[PDB]
């Protein structure tokens, strides 16, 4: 039995400009098994309506998913992603750095 | 050599009842198919299973039909309530993935289902045998006997020639299908014919016994009969003629 | 189009 | 110039709650067109790209039927494999299957494949020639023999060289606007100060398709492989993709480093340096 | 999901080559096979093919022209034993559900080298002066027909075979309860050759 930890990236669909609708993305990948828990955070609180892709896998058998939600960034709001997996001893939070 | 086994092979019954057709696939096979063949429509696939689960049943009539496989070695086709429009020949078949890839299927012997509006039209056959003509004898040194099953209904028959107590095939022809004695009528009774031709020298021998046998498929014990006539049960009616050099 | 009707059992 | 069609299937046993999860997806290149989710009310193969919606009821009933047949085989397999490895019925396990075909620029058949994995590991695979199998361990050797006796390679071989290619051609017609498109990346670079004596250069590549891209850092005309970060190409969520690369350089040496990019989209391979 | 096939019956003389065929209008079909069914018995797979091509298997040859949506089966050196109903069947890659043709009836007529066409009156075994008429020994070229009188029963030709003695013969029987029915009248609706009618 072999398990791989997920690789998380928080980003935006399009270049971020304040006050222009966009989509916030949290792409987890390279993990195994597929069972996983991903949540998108707004100023720490979790967002209720969050769509996600259909499970797929890359050549090395590890899975990848994308979670996203409509949002319009502003100067007055911060975003993060929280991901949990059996390979993680605790859930991991990853803030959305606009410049990165 | 133990192929697909359907049951029963012949079923003559009265409408408004539950007819049960059974099938036992070839041990090892995990795909089972139910087909019906009405002379006026050809072969239709009703349904097919894989590992006991109905995979395709588009062929099933919307209502009054029900198939199922409680286990790998048994499938059921139930029709409730029985109607005439359902009378036909029902086949079963089993097969495996490596065999199906080449469209190979092992078929059962089928079950002839005849459903009647009323059992008062059900009659057995009048078997008679006709001896050769002396004219045919001295003109070709051969003798043709003729058998004649008449007035039976439905047409579930199986005629066979018996010589000296044993069945014979060489030199026999029987009408492919029984004919309707009154094609215009729906309940028309049927007739069937067969010929057996022996050599002149063989018919001209007092020891040689010739028997024509017709197996008939009719009612069983579970069917009522409120009439003076005899109960037209499944039976054998025979005609016989002792050869004679005379 | 998908492979079919069905795949072989392992 | 070269295209492909692939199907990815995933089956996971859920020991403590009825059926196991089953997810199937189809892809033409890097763009997805179908999906099936055992835990979706639909219980139908569903369209996921406009150019496939077009197909009538015969196509959907066929795939639905086929994918349901897939969902069953896997369901049986999890039992079979649980036995071959002599495992308990308490823990979850995953089987994965992936198959499809690649066509060239002329659109003829180039190669076909079919890979089967267990618990995230190779289990059995159809070899290059499409006539033989490769067994990862002794457990698969049992399936290897079984499949060769069932002449399973012929059926796939027929499928791959035939049907999947012919459908691949079809899909390539119906959705040209999107399938034969190529989008060069919108590339730029950033500089973030660190330590007051060192710094990080990140090279970006956005809004590009297909997903096949390259990024390399050079230092004074030589490939800088260590002390450089590179993240897995990520999806934008609109059919285009995103990818970046960073390097850690000592301060005052930012002109020694140059970022390079390769992609069908760009007529000439780019080279990026930090200017302002 | 329609398959078209002419029902026949089509007749050909023993030894000739006969073609059977079906047509379809669904490009989704890619498996084509032929079954053989004898009256009151089940269907037996003969030939099977995948996509286009010509397959030989001894006396049988299956063909399939996907462009034309047209399939054919050739039987060489036809033997009377080949007489039966032939069905085509096909499917796609979506289901094992086969779709069949209505079927074409085939009848390969046997070789009668010494035809001795005659009509005989056969006496009943037990029952008083009952009889029946037996048209026989006529060649396969002859077609027997029904009677114009609905109270007169006539069977089609039927090939009898006495293999132990190498001799097969065609025969047909006619009968009625009507007192106007004699062997001289029987078969007058059919076209029989100039053969023998013995009175007594």
Short mmCIF file of N, CA and C in Angstrom, two decimals, chain D residues 134-212:
data_model
loop_
_atom_site.label_atom_id
_atom_site.label_comp_id
_atom_site.label_asym_id
_atom_site.label_seq_id
_atom_site.Cartn_x
_atom_site.Cartn_y
_atom_site.Cartn_z
N UNK D 134 1.77 -7.13 -20.10
CA UNK D 134 2.84 -7.04 -19.13
C UNK D 134 2.19 -7.11 -17.74
N UNK D 135 2.63 -8.07 -16.92
CA UNK D 135 2.13 -8.25 -15.56
C UNK D 135 3.11 -7.64 -14.57
N UNK D 136 2.64 -6.67 -13.78
CA UNK D 136 3.50 -5.98 -12.78
C UNK D 136 4.02 -6.95 -11.68
N UNK D 137 3.15 -7.87 -11.24
CA UNK D 137 3.48 -8.88 -10.19
C UNK D 137 2.82 -10.23 -10.51
N UNK D 138 2.95 -11.20 -9.60
CA UNK D 138 2.37 -12.55 -9.83
C UNK D 138 0.82 -12.52 -9.83
N UNK D 139 0.23 -11.62 -9.04
CA UNK D 139 -1.24 -11.51 -9.00
C UNK D 139 -1.82 -11.23 -10.39
N UNK D 140 -1.16 -10.38 -11.16
CA UNK D 140 -1.64 -10.02 -12.49
C UNK D 140 -1.41 -11.14 -13.48
N UNK D 141 -0.38 -11.96 -13.20
CA UNK D 141 -0.05 -13.13 -14.05
C UNK D 141 -1.32 -13.99 -14.20
N UNK D 142 -2.11 -14.06 -13.14
CA UNK D 142 -3.36 -14.78 -13.19
C UNK D 142 -4.31 -14.11 -14.19
N UNK D 143 -4.40 -12.79 -14.16
CA UNK D 143 -5.26 -12.06 -15.09
C UNK D 143 -4.65 -12.11 -16.50
N UNK D 144 -3.33 -12.07 -16.56
CA UNK D 144 -2.61 -12.12 -17.83
C UNK D 144 -3.00 -13.37 -18.61
N UNK D 145 -2.94 -14.53 -17.95
CA UNK D 145 -3.30 -15.82 -18.57
C UNK D 145 -4.78 -15.89 -18.93
N UNK D 146 -5.61 -15.43 -18.02
CA UNK D 146 -7.03 -15.43 -18.22
C UNK D 146 -7.37 -14.63 -19.49
N UNK D 147 -6.83 -13.43 -19.58
CA UNK D 147 -7.06 -12.55 -20.72
C UNK D 147 -6.53 -13.12 -22.03
N UNK D 148 -5.38 -13.77 -22.00
CA UNK D 148 -4.86 -14.36 -23.24
C UNK D 148 -5.73 -15.53 -23.69
N UNK D 149 -6.28 -16.29 -22.75
CA UNK D 149 -7.21 -17.39 -23.10
C UNK D 149 -8.55 -16.82 -23.62
N UNK D 150 -8.92 -15.62 -23.17
CA UNK D 150 -10.15 -14.98 -23.62
C UNK D 150 -9.89 -14.11 -24.86
N UNK D 151 -8.67 -14.21 -25.40
CA UNK D 151 -8.28 -13.43 -26.58
C UNK D 151 -8.66 -11.98 -26.42
N UNK D 152 -8.53 -11.46 -25.19
CA UNK D 152 -8.91 -10.05 -24.87
C UNK D 152 -8.09 -9.00 -25.63
N UNK D 153 -6.85 -9.31 -25.96
CA UNK D 153 -6.02 -8.36 -26.70
C UNK D 153 -6.62 -8.06 -28.10
N UNK D 154 -7.11 -9.08 -28.80
CA UNK D 154 -7.69 -8.86 -30.12
C UNK D 154 -8.80 -7.83 -30.07
N UNK D 155 -9.70 -7.96 -29.11
CA UNK D 155 -10.85 -7.05 -29.01
C UNK D 155 -10.41 -5.62 -28.78
N UNK D 156 -9.47 -5.42 -27.87
CA UNK D 156 -8.93 -4.08 -27.65
C UNK D 156 -8.24 -3.59 -28.90
N UNK D 157 -7.31 -4.40 -29.39
CA UNK D 157 -6.54 -4.11 -30.59
C UNK D 157 -7.47 -3.68 -31.71
N UNK D 158 -8.58 -4.38 -31.87
CA UNK D 158 -9.57 -4.01 -32.87
C UNK D 158 -10.16 -2.65 -32.54
N UNK D 159 -10.46 -2.44 -31.26
CA UNK D 159 -11.05 -1.18 -30.81
C UNK D 159 -10.14 0.00 -31.03
N UNK D 160 -8.93 -0.09 -30.47
CA UNK D 160 -7.98 0.99 -30.53
C UNK D 160 -7.67 1.38 -31.98
N UNK D 161 -7.13 0.45 -32.76
CA UNK D 161 -6.78 0.73 -34.18
C UNK D 161 -7.98 1.11 -35.02
N UNK D 162 -9.17 0.74 -34.56
CA UNK D 162 -10.38 0.99 -35.31
C UNK D 162 -11.27 2.05 -34.75
N UNK D 163 -12.25 1.62 -33.97
CA UNK D 163 -13.26 2.51 -33.42
C UNK D 163 -12.74 3.78 -32.71
N UNK D 164 -11.84 3.68 -31.73
CA UNK D 164 -11.43 4.91 -31.01
C UNK D 164 -10.82 5.91 -31.95
N UNK D 165 -10.10 5.44 -32.95
CA UNK D 165 -9.51 6.35 -33.92
C UNK D 165 -10.62 6.99 -34.75
N UNK D 166 -11.53 6.19 -35.25
CA UNK D 166 -12.62 6.73 -36.06
C UNK D 166 -13.50 7.72 -35.30
N UNK D 167 -13.64 7.55 -34.00
CA UNK D 167 -14.42 8.50 -33.21
C UNK D 167 -13.58 9.71 -32.92
N UNK D 168 -12.29 9.48 -32.75
CA UNK D 168 -11.36 10.56 -32.53
C UNK D 168 -11.44 11.48 -33.74
N UNK D 169 -11.48 10.91 -34.96
CA UNK D 169 -11.62 11.72 -36.16
C UNK D 169 -12.92 12.50 -36.14
N UNK D 170 -14.00 11.84 -35.74
CA UNK D 170 -15.29 12.50 -35.72
C UNK D 170 -15.29 13.70 -34.78
N UNK D 171 -14.88 13.49 -33.55
CA UNK D 171 -14.86 14.58 -32.58
C UNK D 171 -13.99 15.74 -33.07
N UNK D 172 -12.93 15.42 -33.81
CA UNK D 172 -12.03 16.44 -34.32
C UNK D 172 -12.70 17.30 -35.39
N UNK D 173 -13.76 16.77 -36.01
CA UNK D 173 -14.53 17.54 -36.99
C UNK D 173 -15.54 18.44 -36.29
N UNK D 174 -16.42 17.82 -35.51
CA UNK D 174 -17.50 18.54 -34.83
C UNK D 174 -17.07 19.73 -33.96
N UNK D 175 -15.88 19.66 -33.36
CA UNK D 175 -15.41 20.76 -32.48
C UNK D 175 -14.09 21.43 -32.87
N UNK D 176 -13.88 21.61 -34.17
CA UNK D 176 -12.63 22.20 -34.65
C UNK D 176 -12.28 23.52 -33.95
N UNK D 177 -13.23 24.47 -33.92
CA UNK D 177 -13.01 25.80 -33.31
C UNK D 177 -12.16 25.71 -32.06
N UNK D 178 -12.36 24.63 -31.30
CA UNK D 178 -11.67 24.43 -30.03
C UNK D 178 -10.58 23.35 -30.02
N UNK D 179 -10.78 22.25 -30.73
CA UNK D 179 -9.81 21.14 -30.67
C UNK D 179 -8.49 21.36 -31.43
N UNK D 180 -8.52 22.11 -32.52
CA UNK D 180 -7.29 22.35 -33.30
C UNK D 180 -6.68 23.69 -32.99
N UNK D 181 -7.25 24.39 -32.00
CA UNK D 181 -6.74 25.69 -31.62
C UNK D 181 -5.47 25.51 -30.83
N UNK D 182 -4.68 26.56 -30.80
CA UNK D 182 -3.46 26.59 -30.03
C UNK D 182 -3.38 27.99 -29.49
N UNK D 183 -3.09 28.12 -28.20
CA UNK D 183 -2.96 29.43 -27.58
C UNK D 183 -1.56 29.57 -26.98
N UNK D 184 -0.77 30.49 -27.53
CA UNK D 184 0.55 30.77 -26.99
C UNK D 184 0.34 31.37 -25.60
N UNK D 185 1.28 31.13 -24.68
CA UNK D 185 1.13 31.65 -23.33
C UNK D 185 1.31 33.16 -23.23
N UNK D 186 0.60 33.78 -22.30
CA UNK D 186 0.77 35.20 -22.02
C UNK D 186 1.80 35.23 -20.90
N UNK D 187 3.07 35.39 -21.27
CA UNK D 187 4.18 35.32 -20.31
C UNK D 187 4.68 36.64 -19.76
N UNK D 188 5.07 36.62 -18.48
CA UNK D 188 5.64 37.78 -17.79
C UNK D 188 6.50 37.28 -16.62
N UNK D 189 7.19 38.19 -15.96
CA UNK D 189 8.09 37.82 -14.85
C UNK D 189 7.93 38.79 -13.66
N UNK D 190 8.23 38.29 -12.45
CA UNK D 190 8.15 39.09 -11.23
C UNK D 190 9.41 38.91 -10.42
N UNK D 191 9.71 39.93 -9.61
CA UNK D 191 10.88 39.96 -8.76
C UNK D 191 10.48 40.28 -7.34
N UNK D 192 10.75 39.37 -6.41
CA UNK D 192 10.43 39.59 -5.00
C UNK D 192 11.69 39.62 -4.13
N UNK D 193 11.94 40.76 -3.50
CA UNK D 193 13.10 40.94 -2.63
C UNK D 193 13.04 40.06 -1.38
N UNK D 194 14.18 39.49 -1.01
CA UNK D 194 14.29 38.66 0.20
C UNK D 194 15.67 38.86 0.87
N UNK D 195 15.69 38.84 2.20
CA UNK D 195 16.94 38.93 2.97
C UNK D 195 17.71 40.27 2.90
N UNK D 196 17.38 41.11 1.91
CA UNK D 196 18.09 42.38 1.69
C UNK D 196 19.48 42.08 1.09
N UNK D 197 19.68 40.84 0.62
CA UNK D 197 20.96 40.45 -0.02
C UNK D 197 20.75 39.30 -1.05
N UNK D 198 19.52 38.78 -1.12
CA UNK D 198 19.17 37.69 -2.03
C UNK D 198 17.74 37.99 -2.59
N UNK D 199 17.28 37.22 -3.59
CA UNK D 199 15.96 37.48 -4.18
C UNK D 199 15.41 36.33 -5.03
N UNK D 200 14.09 36.35 -5.25
CA UNK D 200 13.38 35.29 -6.00
C UNK D 200 12.80 35.77 -7.32
N UNK D 201 13.17 35.10 -8.41
CA UNK D 201 12.64 35.43 -9.74
C UNK D 201 11.63 34.37 -10.17
N UNK D 202 10.39 34.78 -10.39
CA UNK D 202 9.38 33.83 -10.82
C UNK D 202 8.98 34.08 -12.26
N UNK D 203 9.03 33.03 -13.08
CA UNK D 203 8.67 33.13 -14.48
C UNK D 203 7.27 32.55 -14.68
N UNK D 204 6.36 33.35 -15.24
CA UNK D 204 4.96 32.95 -15.46
C UNK D 204 4.59 32.68 -16.92
N UNK D 205 3.63 31.76 -17.10
CA UNK D 205 3.09 31.41 -18.42
C UNK D 205 1.60 31.10 -18.23
N UNK D 206 0.74 31.99 -18.74
CA UNK D 206 -0.71 31.85 -18.55
C UNK D 206 -1.51 31.72 -19.85
N UNK D 207 -2.80 31.40 -19.70
CA UNK D 207 -3.73 31.27 -20.82
C UNK D 207 -3.17 30.55 -22.04
N UNK D 208 -2.70 29.31 -21.85
CA UNK D 208 -2.16 28.54 -22.97
C UNK D 208 -2.80 27.17 -23.10
N UNK D 209 -2.77 26.66 -24.34
CA UNK D 209 -3.32 25.36 -24.69
C UNK D 209 -2.63 24.89 -25.98
N UNK D 210 -2.33 23.58 -26.09
CA UNK D 210 -2.56 22.51 -25.12
C UNK D 210 -1.82 22.72 -23.80
N UNK D 211 -1.88 21.72 -22.92
CA UNK D 211 -1.23 21.80 -21.62
C UNK D 211 0.25 21.50 -21.69
N UNK D 212 0.73 21.05 -22.84
CA UNK D 212 2.14 20.71 -23.01
C UNK D 212 2.94 22.03 -23.11
#
